[PDB]
Design goal:
Chains E, F: This is RNA-binding protein Hfq. This is part of a larger assembly, with six copies of chain A and three copies of chain G. Chain A is an alpha+beta fold. Chain A is built from one helix and six strands; from the N terminus they run αββββββ. Chain A has a three-stranded antiparallel beta sheet with strand order 2-1-6, with no helix packed on it. Chain A has a three-stranded antiparallel beta sheet with strand order 3-4-5, with helices on one face. Chain G has a two-stranded antiparallel sheet. A two-stranded antiparallel sheet of chain G has the order 3-4. Classes of the chains: A alpha+beta, G mainly beta. Chains A and F meet through strand 5 of A and strand 6 of F. Strand 5 of chain E pairs antiparallel with strand 5 of chain F. Chain I binds one RNA strand through helix 1, helix 2, strand 7 and helix 4.
Amino acid sequence: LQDPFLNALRRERVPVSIYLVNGIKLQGQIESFDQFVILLKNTVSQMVYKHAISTVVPSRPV
Amino acid sequence: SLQDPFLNALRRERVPVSIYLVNGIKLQGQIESFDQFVILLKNTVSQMVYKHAISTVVPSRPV
Amino acid sequence: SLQDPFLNALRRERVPVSIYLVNGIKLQGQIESFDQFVILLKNTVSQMVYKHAISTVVPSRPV
Amino acid sequence: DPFLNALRRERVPVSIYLVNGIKLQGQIESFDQFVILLKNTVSQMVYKHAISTVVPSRPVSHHSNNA
Amino acid sequence: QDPFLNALRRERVPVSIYLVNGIKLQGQIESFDQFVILLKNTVSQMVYKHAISTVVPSRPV
Amino acid sequence: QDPFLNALRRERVPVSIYLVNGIKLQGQIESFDQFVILLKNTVSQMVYKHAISTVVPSRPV
Amino acid sequence: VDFGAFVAIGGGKEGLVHISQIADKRVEKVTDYLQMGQEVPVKVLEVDRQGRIRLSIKEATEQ
Amino acid sequence: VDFGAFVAIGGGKEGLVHISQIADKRVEKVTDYLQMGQEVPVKVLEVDRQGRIRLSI
Amino acid sequence: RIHTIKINPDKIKDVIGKGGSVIRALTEETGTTIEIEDDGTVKIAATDGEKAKHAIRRIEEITAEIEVGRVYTGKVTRIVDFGAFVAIGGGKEGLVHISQIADKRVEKVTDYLQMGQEVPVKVLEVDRQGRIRLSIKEAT
RNA sequence: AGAUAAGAAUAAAAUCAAUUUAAAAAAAAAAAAAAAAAAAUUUUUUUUU
């Protein structure tokens, strides 16, 4: 399920490539997670909405 | 919900599928984890995909 | 819930429909199953057309 | 919504716009909290999550009550 | 936010509405709900809030 | 997570607001709610949290 | 023609009519008769966008 | 008329103010505004708009 | 002369213009009287051959000649961030905002601001509404 | 008069005129409710179907 998978990524502190519904790509590292929001410690802290995300992939196997 | 069993049938037969995102993108892989909000892929690239962003699916073979 | 019985009637009659997605793409085929968030429609094989991704539906014949 | 029921009662011709900006001309024939059916030339269903804005061609009678 | 919207409706303030697309609309609030706006224009108009990106008033409420 | 918006409001941080359409806005929170954010920069405006894709600040908080 | 027709009540000049107001939306087809040279009489309905002309099938000063 | 009043501020023509403006309250009847020739406050206060008046009692 | 062309009916509204402004402009710029039948063909009431030819050139430059297809070398004309008004022909400004001009790496309009500079341009927006819009090949 | 049957993915860059069309042109306040719904404190609610 998504919530435990997100916790496992956070636990393993895995760098991910995040994709947005607009066709946006980004790369970052997890700061924290929420039922509606994803927070990243890569560069400046980013609050990314779950309704805005299309896809998530890890750089290294979770 | 009959959608979860359809996805489970694809996972059971480990069928490679073409998943189309609402933005007008084909992605390719094998159906793996499945939640009411998200779908994972068991393909070499382990994708996690939001179902709100999924438009349509076609398989390699009929399920 | 107007949509669910209309979709069931299309599935019962297996009438060819034109479905449009939010991105403006057309698909064509016959409804032969549905659930509260998804439609299974045949052109090559019965397959997923997600209702949240649908903009419009228009049938070939009245149902 | 009572506004959409009032439009259905008065059978007013309306311009509906989609989120992608596609413009549909037709008279609304049925509505649920997910969808409208309009039967302009052929029976068609439009999802409310895909509608951006609706405007009537004729004037529409005020609800004449507190909102 | 609820009182701010009531104040705009009370004061019949001209507002610029922007959808997800690059459209600009001029109107005033006629009625408002957590799912919709009814907007004064050349005619009375319905806007679904899920289509709106931002609203900015010409005068502060 | 929840007070992140309050922390930005407390530090009055100019924050880049990104809408799904790919547009970037700039400004600080005036107040925030589960469904909507009201911005302090220039004229006060309501941006639907539903329409917001991401927020990233000029400084970390 | 299917996408609107030119119909003259009288004279060599041929005035326009369209799929809806030919026959007050009784049919989806442009003409209920659906036949060129067919005998059904025509007169104007009041509605007139400046870029549109209206000549409905109307007998005996129906108005 | 019952439905509203034509109200003169100048030489250039001015259309009907609707009775729903003229009267704040529910009733909206000609008895509230039957007196001819009466001098009254009148501000259109409207840009990007067609001709209207926000007179209100 | 009373010269005539059996030109395509559909362009009628664009040869008249709203308020008849473009027909008034055509007649005054050619110094020649014009009829363009709403249903029928154009007539040109002219004092002499060169003035008739001038009227033909100007109405031909706004009749048919659809700009849908491969790249054309349009004259930039007005240049601003909110748009270069790049015109391939008369009365046809391809209003091309920086969003049309550019994606990813982007730059201040001074990098390519000029008037009358011929530059490569093709269709990016189309409609019946006559809000059809072209764009600089940098849009690729 | 129809909208690409989906560009493996826009580190992120508001498009002109939304009532139309030929000399305009026709012209139109009754409004707080503070969340909609269900369990009976919660949840869904256009912040992941």
